[PDB]
DNA sequence: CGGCATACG
DNA sequence: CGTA
DNA sequence: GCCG
């Protein structure tokens, strides 16, 4: 079991659900209070568990297995012992962490702003509702959708969204393309949104193709919410007799750039930073979505796929479906 | 002990 | 600050 | 919280 997730297949579904969603209870909670350094270990440590090829049963089946240290295997060792561990259920019914993830699930609220309202004495959504002046509005826009942002994207309702950004796309860029990626494209049957990205066979001629297609898709009504290479918008989705508000995130790179953003945006969240990582430390390489520079030759690797990439990085090739940590 | 991913809106 |  |  290699250290870093990068390393490593990581499925979807596996053999330790539970054991990882009470450690990823811990990071969360971490990361409601700052603590970045915890957050990443409890991370790390439940995606070791995702990727274990059966259950874990004994406590000394945790030996040698990496980001395993006395807090992590007490945690284990008291759901293994009693199907529950204290600290988590504390965790759990604690006012400060239901608050702070009821209100950091808020489109356009984060733990900065969260932890602040919390300290103001606020503590459910009415109570953001009953005083807008505080408000930005992107959050008034998270607020009022909250309802419909917190139901499950299903991958029925991907295929109608995609089908709009191809037709919107296809307009204001005849040849450009659209990719499914985020969760989606590593396999998940839901998620909080669905995340595309837009490039152009033509190396420039995606250039200002953001705008273009933001303003096609405002004018068939479809944006209830947007604020360029990046947006994150609400559509509106249609569903039998009426629709429903979806997050979708769009971005656009060029072709040149393609893989590097496909490999970035397609995730998981913790495997692109432990990527990111090991490239840094292990082979002295700095990767992000735009591409994987060398600091000392001060060059750039020009990739045409994601096997490029981990070619250049000599790391196993990991489909999508495989880099769920 | 230092480090913990990386960038855009 | 928010977001991915 | 854990690694190196
Ligand atoms: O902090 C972040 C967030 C997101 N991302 C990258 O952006 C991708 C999409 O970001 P996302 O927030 O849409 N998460 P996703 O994996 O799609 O699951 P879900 O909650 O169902 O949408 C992720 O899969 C990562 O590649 C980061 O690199 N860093
Ligand atoms: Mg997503
Ligand atoms: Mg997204
Ligand atoms: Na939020």
Redesign the pocket.
Not at 35 to 38: A, D, L, P
């Given at each position: 079991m290699?250290?870093?997730a990068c390393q490593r297949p990581t499925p979807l579904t596996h053999h330790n659900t539970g054991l990882s969603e009470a450690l990823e209870i811990?990071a969360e909670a971490?990361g409601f209070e700052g603590?970045?350094?915890?957050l990443?270990?409890?991370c790390?440590?439940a995606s070791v568990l995702k990727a274990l090829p059966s259950p874990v049963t004994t406590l000394s089946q945790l030996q040698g297995?990496?980001?395993?240290?006395?807090?992590?295997?007490?945690?284990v060792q008291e759901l293994l012992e009693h199907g529950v561990c204290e600290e988590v259920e504390r965790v759990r019914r604690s006012e400060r962490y239901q608050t702070m993830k009821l209100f950091?699930q808020?489109?356009?609220?984060?733990?900065?702003?969260?932890?602040?309202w919390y300290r103001e004495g606020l503590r459910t959504l009415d109570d953001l509702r009953e005083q807008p002046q505080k408000l930005?509005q992107?959050?008034k826009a998270?607020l009022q959708h909250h309802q419909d942002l917190s139901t499950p994207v299903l991958r029925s309702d991907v295929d109608a969204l995609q089908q709009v950004v191809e037709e919107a796309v296809g307009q204001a860029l005849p040849g450009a393309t659209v990719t499914l990626?985020?969760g989606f494209r590593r396999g998940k049957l839901q998620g909080?949104?669905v995340?595309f990205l837009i490039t152009h066979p033509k190396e420039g001629q995606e250039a200002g193709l953001?705008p273009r297609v933001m303003c096609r898709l405002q004018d068939q009504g479809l944006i209830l919410y947007?604020?360029?290479?990046?947006?994150?918008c609400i559509f509106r989705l249609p569903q039998p007799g009426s629709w429903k508000a979806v997050?979708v995130?769009l971005?656009?790179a060029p072709v040149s750039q393609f893989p590097f953003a496909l490999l970035?945006?397609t995730?998981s969240?913790?495997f692109?930073?432990?990527?990111?990582?090991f490239?840094?430390?292990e082979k002295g390489l700095?990767?992000?979505?735009?591409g994987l520079?060398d600091p000392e030759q001060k060059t750039f690797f020009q990739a045409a796929s994601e096997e490029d990439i981990f070619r250049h990085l000599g790391l196993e090739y990991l489909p999508p479906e495989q880099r769920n940590a």
């Open positions: 290699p250290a870093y811990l971490a603590s970045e350094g915890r990443l270990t409890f790390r440590a297995l990496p980001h395993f240290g006395e807090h992590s295997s007490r945690v950091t808020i489109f356009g609220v984060g733990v900065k702003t969260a932890d602040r930005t992107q959050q998270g990626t985020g909080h949104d995340d953001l947007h604020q360029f290479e990046r947006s994150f997050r995130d971005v656009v970035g945006w995730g969240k913790l692109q930073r432990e990527l990111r990582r490239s840094r430390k700095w990767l992000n979505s735009h520079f």
